[PDB]
Design a protein around this ligand. Structure first.
Ligand SMILES: Cn1ncc2c(C(=O)Nc3ccc4c(c3)CNC4)cc(C3CC3)nc21
Lengths: 156, 39
């Protein structure tokens, strides 16, 4: 099917009409998304099939057709860009300065933007346009809002 | 059965909408990859 580099919508026809369950990045013949979007199920791209290659429920990441290729990371200083791909709406870049998720295993980036759960998998970019992580896994704060972490995989 | 559709190129766009705050949150990650606020 289509394996051109870029950002893609993850849809399903299992419910009423076509519903967007998430987003993903195609880079170097590998489609990268969040595990909670596809649950490790095979994906379709026209007549072609995309089979899972790597996945981890704790990291909440999954790769298709090959190993994880995205290796860039937030510098802890600069403003990033969430390339948001919302259900039924056109892709839109939103520049923001991330906060920090402080954990027992180290600090991670965190973008505080408000989008439907179906926006999960949309890439977060650095000034060079490099994917420094995926948007869609985080926490609910005091005002009911969602704050997502910047989730990156490991390149071997 | 899930399927993918192209939604565009991945590039940084200058003069984009600049919004969102930067909060520092003490969190915990469980075995299921689910985050939770620590207090
Ligand atoms: C506003 N809002 N409310 C909920 C959500 C979620 C969400 O449920 N993520 C999720 C679900 C299941 C699992 C994991 C994450 C990881 N383990 C399994 C995602 C987003 C993304 C746009 C930010 N917004 C949400």
């Amino acid at each position: 099917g289509e394996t051109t580099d870029g950002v893609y919508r993850v849809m399903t026809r299992r419910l009423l009409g076509s519903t967007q369950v998430g987003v993903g990045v195609m880079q170097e013949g590998v489609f990268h998304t969040m595990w909670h979007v596809t649950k490790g199920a095979a994906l379709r791209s026209g007549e072609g099939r995309l089979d899972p290659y790597w996945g981890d429920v704790k990291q909440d990441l999954v790769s298709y057709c090959g190993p994880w290729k995205l290796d860039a990371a937030w510098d802890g200083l600069s403003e990033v860009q969430l390339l948001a791909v919302p259900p039924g709406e056109r892709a839109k870049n939103i520049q923001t300065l991330p906060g920090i998720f402080k954990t027992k295993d180290g600090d991670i980036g965190a973008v505080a933007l408000d989008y439907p759960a179906g926006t999960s998998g949309s890439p977060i970019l650095d000034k060079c346009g490099r994917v420094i992580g995926l948007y869609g896994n985080g926490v609910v704060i005091k005002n009911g809002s969602y704050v997502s972490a910047i989730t990156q995989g490991k390149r071997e | 059965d899930m399927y993918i559709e192209r939604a565009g190129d991945i590039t940084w766009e200058k003069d984009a909408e600049v919004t969102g705050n930067s909060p520092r949150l003490d969190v915990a990650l469980d075995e299921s990859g689910d985050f939770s606020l620590v207090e």
